[PDB]
Amino acid sequence: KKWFSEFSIMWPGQAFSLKIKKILYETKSKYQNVLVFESTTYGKVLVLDGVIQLTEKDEFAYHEMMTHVPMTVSKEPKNVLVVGGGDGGIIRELCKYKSVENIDICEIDETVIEVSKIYFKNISCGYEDKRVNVFIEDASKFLENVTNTYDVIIVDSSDPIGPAETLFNQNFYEKIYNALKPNGYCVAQCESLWIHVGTIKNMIGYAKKLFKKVEYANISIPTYPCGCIGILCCSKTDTGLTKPNKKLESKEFADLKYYNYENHSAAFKLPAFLLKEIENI
Amino acid sequence: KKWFSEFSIMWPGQAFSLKIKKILYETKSKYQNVLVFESTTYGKVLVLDGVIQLTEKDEFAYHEMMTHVPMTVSKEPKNVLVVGGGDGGIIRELCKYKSVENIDICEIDETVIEVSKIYFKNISCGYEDKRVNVFIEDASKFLENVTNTYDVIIVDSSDPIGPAETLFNQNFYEKIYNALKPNGYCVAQCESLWIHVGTIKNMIGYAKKLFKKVEYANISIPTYPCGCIGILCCSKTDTGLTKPNKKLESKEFADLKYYNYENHSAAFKLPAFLLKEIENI
Ligand SMILES: CSC[C@H]1O[C@@H](n2cnc3c(N)ncnc32)[C@H](O)[C@@H]1O
Ligand SMILES: CSC[C@H]1O[C@@H](n2cnc3c(N)ncnc32)[C@H](O)[C@@H]1O
Ligand SMILES: NCc1ccc(N)cc1
Ligand SMILES: NCc1ccc(N)cc1
């Protein structure tokens, strides 16, 4: 048995590895290299341009926290946009809210969707929901063109090298601002406090040029580099996203494996050094 | 340049790797294999039996949280025992409390101490403190024999395979109980919620057979497996260790890089699935 290893200039000097039970599918799509394997201990794994995007064992931690943070703060969210997220995990979590009327997803690479429907059936099951509408386009252009405004936008992107390069700049954050309702919320994958503090500061800086309240929360997930991933949180009201306005008690949420009411606020209690770096932006 | 890789039957199917700038020292001590290298991005690294024990870039997260959790809850701690901890990082953090009168350390392998004094000078600097007394012995025997009782015991062990095998059993926890003051606290390295839940349950079960209040807290640290490490927390009073009784405001604590008042309590807000596994023990 061989091993998959995740090396990158975005985290030089380190690498994480998973033992391969069997390769399931590889291809070169119009945007990126796509790989899918069954690991010996983390179940199935999806890779894009050499970088791990999810595994069945732990994806629930990142998908539950990116979704339920903003969706327990938003009072009555009707219309939600997912940027990126071809795997469908966010969408799966959004579907659990009966009151949601529409879920748009803008994903640049339809191969990701198709591969996920074929190889990750418990992650892509929400595509079946009649409220979901798929657009295959660069979200940088989609957000320049869209007529609707959203109650919540969840930016489930890949990393800045590759097709997501258009999603980590000031201009993208203006477009997010303009496409949210006046009391709307954005959350965005914002990388690892252990090694990407220069990025994190830039992103916070971009977001603060527009939004009243910009916060940062941290998620424990073994299969992203350094064992964790941040959520950059944007709010038009001074109140922000650390405090849920509701509990998730109905039967659609019984199965939740990471998120709960308490760890929502916990996730925003950051390490001393990050606070010190962040203040003064 | 070669890479160091951390493979183990304690985390099958995964491995974490660091790029090696230069090997500094290797030996076979009476208890274990010892390796020290300078990494390209994490600074210097100490390995024992193929397993990473610390790196200069991140050790502060594990050393600050294991120490300051219990030391902000203990009202006036006079006498503290460190089990394991040859590197001296706990001791470094303990020395910052002026009111501490004595710090005992029981480490089985003196080579670890010596290597740390030579190669990790900002981690071992606390050995110079006149309050510190070193015993070279298996802590399982030391705790059977010691006459003093402690206000706080910090069990900074290596993993269960190797010489620390005597420290992950019921009998060790009775010895810890008997060597604490009647209002005394123990904290112990208790592994990763992502992959060691069977262990975590056993340890909680051992601790609950004796202690009034057993809690579990989680630390984000990129260089342990799965990106995180737990602290098993033992308390003789129903009040427990989630809430600090003091703030660390004096000049000896200004330099702290992870711990603060808020993230003390945050660290005990665990993922939904762990709560579900833990309840009923
Ligand atoms: C896998 S979840 C992350 C997803 O982000 C998608 N992605 C990257 N860049 C963009 C973009 N500019 N617009 C929409 N989706 C993107 C990737 O194709 C990937 O499927
Ligand atoms: C490096 S911090 C962990 C330390 O635990 C020490 N250790 C392992 N087993 C025992 C034991 N039974 N008693 C004391 N120290 C131990 C190891 O030698 C190591 O230096
Ligand atoms: N789309 C989530 C994600 C997070 C971190 C990394 N590296 C890649 C994907
Ligand atoms: N002594 C701290 C420690 C924690 C986890 C592992 N694996 C090894 C050492």
Numbering used by the authors:
A (entry chain A), B (entry chain A): 41 to 321
Q: What does the publication say?
A:
Spermidine synthase (SpdS; putrescine aminopropyltransferase) catalyzes the transfer of the aminopropyl moiety from decarboxylated S-adenosylmethionine to putrescine, leading to the formation of spermidine and 5′-methylthio­adenosine (MTA). In this work, X-ray crystallography was used to examine ligand complexes of SpdS from the malaria parasite Plasmodium falciparum (PfSpdS). The active site of SpdS is located between the domains and consists of two interconnected clefts for binding dcAdoMet and putrescine. A conserved flexible structural element called the gatekeeper loop covers the active site of the enzyme.
The complexes with the aniline compounds and BIPA revealed a new mode of ligand binding to PfSpdS. The aminomethyl N atom is positioned at a hydrogen-bonding distance from the carboxylate O atoms of Asp196, the backbone carbonyl O atom of Ser197 and a water molecule. However, in this case the distances to the hydroxyl O atom of Tyr102 are longer (∼4 Å) than the respective distance observed for the putrescine N atom (3.2 Å). The aromatic ring can also engage in a π-stacking interaction with Tyr264, with a ring centre-to-centre distance of 4.0 Å. The binding mode of MTA was essentially identical to those found in the other structures. The results establish experimentally that the putrescine-binding site may accommodate small aromatic compounds and not only aliphatic amines, a finding which, together with the other results, may lead to new approaches for the design of SpdS inhibitors.
